[PDB]
Design an enzyme around this catalytic site. Sequence first.
Site, short mmCIF file in Angstrom:
data_model
loop_
_atom_site.label_atom_id
_atom_site.label_comp_id
_atom_site.label_asym_id
_atom_site.label_seq_id
_atom_site.Cartn_x
_atom_site.Cartn_y
_atom_site.Cartn_z
N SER A 46 0.79 -1.23 0.00
CA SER A 46 0.00 0.00 0.00
C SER A 46 0.82 1.27 0.00
O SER A 46 0.25 2.35 -0.10
CB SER A 46 -0.97 0.03 1.18
OG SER A 46 -1.91 -1.02 1.11
N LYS A 49 0.33 4.14 -2.57
CA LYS A 49 -0.79 5.07 -2.54
C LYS A 49 -0.33 6.51 -2.32
O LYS A 49 -1.04 7.44 -2.70
CB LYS A 49 -1.82 4.64 -1.49
CG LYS A 49 -2.45 3.30 -1.79
CD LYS A 49 -3.26 2.77 -0.64
CE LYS A 49 -3.71 1.34 -0.89
NZ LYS A 49 -4.44 0.81 0.29
N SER A 107 -5.67 3.97 3.98
CA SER A 107 -5.26 2.89 3.08
C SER A 107 -6.48 2.18 2.50
O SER A 107 -6.50 0.96 2.35
CB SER A 107 -4.32 1.89 3.76
OG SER A 107 -3.37 1.42 2.83
N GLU A 143 -5.61 -3.23 -6.28
CA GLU A 143 -5.78 -3.77 -4.94
C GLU A 143 -6.91 -4.79 -4.88
O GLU A 143 -7.90 -4.65 -5.59
CB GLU A 143 -6.07 -2.66 -3.94
CG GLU A 143 -4.98 -1.62 -3.80
CD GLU A 143 -3.73 -2.15 -3.12
OE1 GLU A 143 -2.78 -1.35 -2.98
OE2 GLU A 143 -3.69 -3.34 -2.74
N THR A 214 0.81 -3.24 4.68
CA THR A 214 0.78 -4.57 5.27
C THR A 214 0.38 -5.50 4.15
O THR A 214 -0.67 -5.32 3.54
CB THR A 214 -0.28 -4.69 6.38
OG1 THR A 214 -0.10 -3.65 7.35
CG2 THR A 214 -0.20 -6.05 7.07
C1 LIG Z 1 -1.58 -2.17 1.87
O1 LIG Z 1 -0.44 -2.40 2.21
C2 LIG Z 1 -2.76 -3.03 2.24
C3 LIG Z 1 -3.42 -3.55 0.96
C4 LIG Z 1 -2.45 -4.37 0.12
O2 LIG Z 1 -4.55 -4.35 1.30
C5 LIG Z 1 -3.67 -2.18 3.12
C6 LIG Z 1 -4.34 -3.02 4.22
C7 LIG Z 1 -3.59 -2.59 5.46
S1 LIG Z 1 -3.77 -3.36 6.94
C8 LIG Z 1 -5.32 -4.19 6.94
C9 LIG Z 1 -5.99 -4.06 8.30
N1 LIG Z 1 -6.29 -2.64 8.42
C10 LIG Z 1 -7.12 -2.23 9.28
N2 LIG Z 1 -7.71 -3.05 10.03
C11 LIG Z 1 -2.78 -1.56 5.16
C12 LIG Z 1 -1.89 -0.79 6.02
O3 LIG Z 1 -1.54 0.35 5.61
O4 LIG Z 1 -1.48 -1.24 7.12
N3 LIG Z 1 -2.83 -1.26 3.86
#
Ligand SMILES: *C(=O)[C@H]([C@@H](C)O)[C@H]1CC(SCCNC=N)=C(C(=O)O)N1
EC number: 3.5.2.6
Length: 268
Positions: A46, A49, A107, A143, A214
Amino acid sequence: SEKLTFKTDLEKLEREKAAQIGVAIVDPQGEIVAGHRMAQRFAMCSTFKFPLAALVFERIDSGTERGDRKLSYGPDMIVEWSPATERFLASGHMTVLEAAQAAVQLSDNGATNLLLREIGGPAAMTQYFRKIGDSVSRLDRKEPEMGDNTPGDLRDTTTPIAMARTVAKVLYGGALTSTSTHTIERWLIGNQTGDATLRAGFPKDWVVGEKTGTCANGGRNDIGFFKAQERDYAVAVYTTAPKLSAVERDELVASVGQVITQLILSTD
Ligand SMILES: *C(=O)[C@H]([C@@H](C)O)[C@H]1CC(SCCNC=N)=C(C(=O)O)N1
Ligand code: NA
């Protein structure tokens, strides 16, 4: 040697956590301050972004996009982790600026895809990287599949040094107007997803803004900027730690923040 301490401390974390830690810190002109695995490729997840929002701001600055333009959508645009897109669904749209702010600060995956559907897809994101002098970063998918992070896959990757230099270009290198630059910096400072990661490891008086990631196979990333007194820096941290729990991966990135801090403080 402060840089040797930095290297040694990162290697200790890698050994003890069974992790790989990529770091680059650059000055506003892109000059290297320090790094680790700095030209190894890592999944962007992410973190892209932030560059996506920069692309959007460049278009707004130029006049080829309008921030208030309404982007209509239906439930087809809701994917995993789309909190704002879900809330705005009944209304039927988000503006370009609403979507960009949700992408950066929450995100929000749906908002990210909404903007990708507009600006010309992964090919157009990649062309923006090339335009600003980043020949390394590449977006290949939308995504959330772009975060699959298959070991060795070069799709949807960057390197710590390429991304840190991209951050510096966007914030300090004149990519955006003064107004748009200030706005994107405020968005990064007000990010809602990074309280436990890099910024948790920095001194409380540093001005810090960042964008987290993440992703699968233990990816945990954080990119952005910090101002230590009057000195501005751009930073990119990419980590892979498949054996750690989610909370432990957060703590790993915070620990990298501490290692960065020790270097910056000790080198005057
Ligand atoms: C980016 O890195 C991811 C994407 C690939 O799905 C999103 C999801 C998350 S963490 C998911 C849980 N979030 C809240 N409960 C992130 C992040 O920035 O940590 N980006
Ligand atoms: Na639909």
